[PDB]
Amino acid sequence: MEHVAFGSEDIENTLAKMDDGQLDGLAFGAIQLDGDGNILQYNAAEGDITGRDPKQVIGKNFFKDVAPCTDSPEFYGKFKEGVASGNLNTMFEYTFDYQMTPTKVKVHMKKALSGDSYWVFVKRV
Ligand SMILES: *C(=O)/C=C/c1ccc(O)cc1
């Protein structure tokens, strides 16, 4: 493992050092999105939760193609408000149910420290 707790206050600073391999050492799912919702990074824990193969989803649009069940005010609407504002820090439960067994999770979206990119962190509940 990497030693980082889900929901940690300074998670964006800790995950700024991780390349894709390091991200694969987290205890929770982690996705890095650009401001349009294209997938930049997608770790092994997330693939275990959702069934997606990480290298096959990087470059895809999370809200349009990968995760249409999240294209809603309750998930994508929060994301795009945060992108537009340039600030995002929200944690909520959600169900992932697209071409998969419905899976209840806790989601934490947080703007990355540098640049303009956005983390989506996920764990089972
Ligand atoms: C709903 O369509 C959710 C889909 C989904 C969520 C999270 C992922 O990493 C992959 C697909």
Distance set, CA 46 to CA 23, 84, 101 (Å): 10, 26, 15
Please tell me the number of Cα atoms within 13 Å of 46 on its side-chain side. Answer: 29
Specify the experimental method: X-ray
**How many whole angstroms from 66 Cα to the centroid of ligand 1?**
6
Locus of tokens 């939760």: 49
Is the CB–ligand 1 distance for residue 43 below 6 Å? Answer: no
**What CATH number belongs to 1-125?**
3.30.450.20
The angle subtended at Cα 105 by Cα 125 and Cα 67, nearest 5°, is: 165
Distance (Å, whole) CA 57 – CA 44: 12
**Residue 42 neighbours by CB distance under 10 Å:** 29
- Do residues 29 and 122 make contact, with C-beta atoms less than 8 angstroms apart? yes
- Do residues 88 and 110 make contact, with C-beta atoms less than 8 angstroms apart? yes
The total number of residues written for the chain in this structure: 125
Is the CB–ligand 1 distance for residue 46 below 6 Å? Answer: yes
**How many whole angstroms from 96 Cα to the centroid of ligand 1?**
6
- CB contact set of 114 (below 8 Å; sequence gap of 6+): 16
- This PDB structure is determined at a resolution in Å of 1.0
Distance set, CA 30 to CA 19, 46, 50, 67 (Å): 12, 6, 12, 14
